DNA sequence: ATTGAGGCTGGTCATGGCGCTCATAAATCTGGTATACTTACCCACATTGGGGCTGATTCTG
């Protein structure tokens, strides 16, 4: 739910993008892995107050 | 500057705990009726306004 009124489910997103649900899942997992890769999001890691 | 393989782009098949929906049920929430006789509670100032006089110009017997 980023920069929009509401979020969209994975199936509606796949339908809008003409991409299967599993391919959408794999692309999301690749994006999450790339964000978990180091040398990035250092301020995001610093955003924890514990 | 080609043709022989690895990494990575397309989709397969269910899969699995989660959430919305149906139904049961005792606890919680509402309305109702009692026929010996019981009858009235328990500080000091300053200002404006209302009501009772107080003359003072108009009229009277």
TrEMBL record:
Signal peptide: none
Region span, Sigma-70 factor domain-4: 1-37
Residue spans binding DNA: 10-29
Cellular compartment(s): Cytoplasm
Function statement: Sigma factors are initiation factors that promote the attachment of RNA polymerase to specific initiation sites and are then released. This sigma factor is the primary sigma factor during exponential growth.
Subunit structure: Interacts transiently with the RNA polymerase catalytic core.
Family: Belongs to the sigma-70 factor family. RpoD/SigA subfamily.
Protein's name in the database: RNA polymerase sigma factor RpoD
Gene this protein is translated from: rpoD
Residue window of the full protein shown: 564 to 613 of 613
